[PDB]
């Protein structure tokens, strides 16, 4: 079987509520409404090409890449002070080649963000985030970013590709090590079984 994943099957690739909870160490995370388009809400990053290194599914990042469809979910415990937060998305491309090219581009951009602090402005609010080094083994990339302050809030970004599908994950919390890497690998397993 060498057929690509159909656009209409993207939602079946995401992790369910049990799976998200299990990775994150929670029993109460809940998903929001399906996300079915790229995010074009404005955000300013002091190094503009680090936008994708901070957030999944960003319009300025995916624009022009040939993607055909995106399906995602954001999950967290209820309330304003959730312990865990996950944004998981899968992005369909016409071919494996185009999907892989996008991850390669992402790897180039993330490597220029590694080991740097950037300033991010959103809704007239400004915060600084510090990137660790880019990790992972082909075709997966990961990087941990840490929000300034004594909270210790952090996010791990993970991106991978299988078949014609790019897997794009942001997992955040106070005890981040490789949750986004785990999520990505589980989504890749779902792509593989399509
Ligand atoms: Tb957003
Ligand atoms: Tb906060």
Ligand lying nearest the CA atom of residue 42: 1
Place of tokens 């740097």: 116
Resolution to 1 decimal, in Å?
1.7
- Assess contact for 11 and 34: CB atoms under 8 A: yes
Q: Sketch out the chain's domains with CATH numbers.
A: 1-194 (3.40.1000.70)
Ligand lying nearest the CA atom of residue 43: 1
Q: How far apart are CA 40 and CA 33, in angstroms?
A: 17
Ligand lying nearest the CA atom of residue 149: 2
Q: How far apart are CA 129 and CA 54, in angstroms?
A: 9
Q: How far apart are CA 166 and CA 164, in angstroms?
A: 7
Q: How far apart are CA 134 and CA 39, in angstroms?
A: 24
* Residue 94 Cα to ligand 1 middle (Å): 25
The CA-to-CA distance between both ends of the chain, in Å, stands at 10
């Amino acid at each position: 079987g060498h057929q690509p994943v159909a656009e209409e099957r993207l939602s079946a690739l995401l992790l369910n509520s049990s799976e998200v909870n299990a990775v994150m160490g929670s029993s109460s995370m809940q998903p929001g409404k399906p996300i079915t388009s790229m995010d074009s809400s404005p955000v300013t990053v002091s190094l503009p090409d680090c936008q994708g290194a901070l957030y999944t599914s960003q319009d300025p990042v995916y624009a022009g890449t040939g993607y055909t469809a995106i399906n995602g979910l954001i999950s967290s415990e209820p309330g304003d002070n959730y312990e865990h937060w996950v944004n998981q998305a899968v992005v369909a491309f016409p071919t494996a080649d185009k999907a892989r090219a996008f991850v390669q581009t992402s790897a180039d951009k993330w490597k220029n963000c590694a080991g740097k602090t950037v300033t991010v402005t959103n809704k007239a609010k400004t915060y600084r985030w510090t990137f660790a080094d880019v990790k992972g083994s082909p075709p997966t990339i990961t990087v941990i970013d840490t929000q300034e302050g004594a909270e210790g809030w952090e996010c791990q970004r993970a991106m991978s590709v299988a078949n014609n599908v790019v897997v794009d994950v942001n997992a955040c919390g106070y005890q981040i090590t490789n949750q986004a890497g785990q999520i990505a690998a589980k989504i890749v397993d779902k792509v593989n079984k399509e």
